[PDB]
């Protein structure tokens, strides 16, 4: 099927251009206002470009010639490329998920991990260590003649060789530990934010509760309701006191309380009256605003809980079925090779699994969008 | 360790009169309030009064209103309370008690200290 | 006022048992309930504080809980010291103040 790479190909090497670009600068404006993703949107950019500029001569090759008509030890240099470009991409948005899920759930082990160094020397040390992972099948040039054929690489139809054991390490190791991680990160994140909706909850209905009496003294017809509603005022009060300066700001509620209670008892109406004008102004001047940082923090963590539900969806989408025909193709070589049927029906599946798996290109600067915009 | 002493009597006739007195001894009633706790033979615990002598405000339950009063005197660190128009269902074992004030942990303790016990009878 | 009842009025276990005695309140009120002990001819002695806090001195063995108009007192063994009555009282204000009903620790056999 010759339309399958042409057209997705195109589409890479024609979306991705202008919006790579745009995303550089738009985390470069984030590195020099003290962030730390801008780094890595730096590694994933030049990433994504370094393999863009390698896509134009493939789709040179293909859409009129069928005999490769570059260099035939040519197509060997443009390999590594792809493999380095597929799995920085899932490490660096691995490395995205796992410092967004420790800077939302552990602020204590998040502070030294924010600065911005520490996410350089990671993504220096990252671009090594797959670097020295890569540079497998370079040094040895036997190695590329196992299974690239003698033109228009395809991988080898005989596959022979250690090659059943390096794809099903590749299989293992690549997909399904950052996918893993990736899933306990979105499900911690879950679970706090669950944990603080239940939280805010009842302070909410305390302060509810503290208002409805306050509206009940106002008029105080007689001496009763006075004390019957101080009573619900000090129990959610306390209460109040007890989910969260602002703590001074609720003692001092609870002596004027008491206060009003002291004087209703008596046996007087109007001075208990008075207290409660008075409790009006410490009401409006304390809680207020402890009540408004706590509402303005849940929605933080809302954007950090769609964050990392959006990048397990991406990671899911782009290279799931290429890793899995890989997997099943090694394991199908590793026990009877007379059934060569399988391998008849899915040659042209494996193809199109590896030459679908290039959107990370287009799909990666779409993420910046869900975090500070600007790019696009 | 504080101790709360409770001196009072015994054998008052109907409609009688009596006066009892709960020294304190190691805090000073100045910082604390004192209340009373009364248990009838083979029964529960009840509240009967309350005082602060710094503030001044006094309460009292529903059965003891009018006929009891709770003086609490600093210079003698002592609290009383005035027992008149006496029945025989008030024939119970007395406590005096101890709270602290709100400001900290001295509210949240409740009644960590109790006295000993003092026994009236109420019998013609 | 508030309303504070005991479930077990009495209770027959023996030595190295379990035992939990709940209060329920009528008004949710804080964490504002406190356990005693009483034995024949004796001032009560406090316990836990707080809905659930241990007292200053007294063995380690007693606990608490609090669930919501909701207070448990458990203790993990019985030693023959442990068979007395127990109370429930709550705090929240100084005129507001009420015990539980009582509840009773005998030998069974």
């Known amino acids: 099927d010759h339309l399958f790479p042409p057209s997705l190909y195109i589409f890479v090497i024609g979306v991705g251009l202008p919006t790579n670009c745009l995303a550089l600068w738009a985390a470069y404006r984030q590195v020099q206002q003290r962030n730390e993703l801008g780094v890595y949107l730096m590694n994933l950019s030049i990433a994504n470009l370094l393999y863009i500029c390698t896509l134009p001569l493939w789709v040179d090759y293909f859409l009129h010639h069928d005999n490769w008509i570059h260099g035939p030890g040519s197509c060997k240099l443009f390999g590594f490329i792809f493999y380095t470009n597929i799995y920085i991409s899932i490490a660096f948005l691995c490395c995205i998920s796992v410092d967004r899920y420790l800077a939302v759930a552990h602020p204590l082990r998040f502070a030294r991990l924010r600065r911005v160094k520490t996410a350089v020397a990671v993504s220096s040390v990252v671009w090594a260590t797959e670097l020295g992972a890569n540079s497998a099948p370079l040094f040895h040039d036997e190695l590329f003649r196992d299974r690239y054929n003698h033109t228009f690489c395809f991988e080898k139809f005989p596959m022979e060789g250690w090659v059943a054991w390096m794809n099903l390490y590749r299989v293992f190791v690549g997909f399904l530990f950052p996918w893993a991680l990736m899933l306990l990160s979105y499900r911690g994140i879950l679970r706090a934010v669950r944990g603080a909706r239940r939280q805010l909850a009842d302070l909410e209905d305390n302060w509810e509760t503290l208002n409805d009496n306050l509206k009940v003294i106002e008029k105080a017809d007689n001496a009763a309701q006075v004390k019957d509603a101080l009573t619900k005022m000090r129990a959610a009060a306390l209460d109040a006191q007890k989910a969260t300066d602002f703590r001074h700001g609720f003692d001092i509620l609870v002596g004027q309380i008491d206060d009003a209670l002291k004087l209703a008892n008596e046996g007087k109406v109007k001075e208990a009256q008075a207290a409660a004008e008075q409790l009006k102004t410490t009401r409006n001047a304390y809680i207020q605003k402890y009540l408004e940082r706590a509402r303005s923090t849940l929605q933080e963590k809302a954007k950090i809980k769609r964050l990392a539900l959006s990048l397990i969806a991406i990671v899911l989408v782009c290279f799931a079925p290429y890793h899995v025909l890989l997997l099943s193709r090694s394991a199908i070589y590793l026990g009877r090779p007379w059934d060569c049927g399988f391998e008849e029906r899915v040659f042209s599946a494996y193809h199109s699994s590896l030459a679908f798996t290039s959107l990370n290109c287009v799909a990666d600067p779409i993420l910046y969008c869900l975090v500070n915009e600007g790019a696009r | 360790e504080v101790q709360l002493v409770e001196s009072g009597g015994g054998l008052v006739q109907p409609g009688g009169s009596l006066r009892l007195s709960c020294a304190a001894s190691?805090?000073?009633?100045?910082?604390?309030?004192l209340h009373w706790v009364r248990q009838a033979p083979g029964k529960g615990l009840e509240w009967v009064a309350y005082?602060?002598?710094?503030?001044?405000?006094?309460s009292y339950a529903d059965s003891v209103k009018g006929r009891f009063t709770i003086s609490a005197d600093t210079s003698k660190n002592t609290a009383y309370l005035q027992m008149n128009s006496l029945r025989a269902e008030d024939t119970a074992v007395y406590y005096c008690a101890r709270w602290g004030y709100w400001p900290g942990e001295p509210w949240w303790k409740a009644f960590d200290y109790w006295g000993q016990g003092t026994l009236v009878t109420v019998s013609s | 006022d508030i309303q504070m009842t005991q479930s077990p009025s009495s209770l027959s276990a023996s030595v190295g048992d379990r035992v939990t005695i709940t209060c329920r309140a009528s008004q949710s009120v804080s964490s504002a309930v406190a356990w005693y002990q009483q034995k024949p001819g004796k001032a009560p002695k406090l316990l836990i504080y707080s809905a659930s806090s241990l007292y200053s001195g007294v063995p380690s063995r007693f606990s608490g809980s609090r669930s919501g108009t909701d207070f448990t007192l458990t203790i993990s063994s019985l030693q023959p010291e442990d068979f007395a009555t127990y109370y429930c009282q709550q705090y929240l204000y100084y005129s507001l103040v009420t015990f539980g009903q009582g509840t009773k620790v005998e030998i069974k056999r």
């Open positions: 190691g805090f000073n009633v100045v910082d604390f309030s």
């Open positions: 005082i602060s002598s710094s503030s001044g405000s006094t």
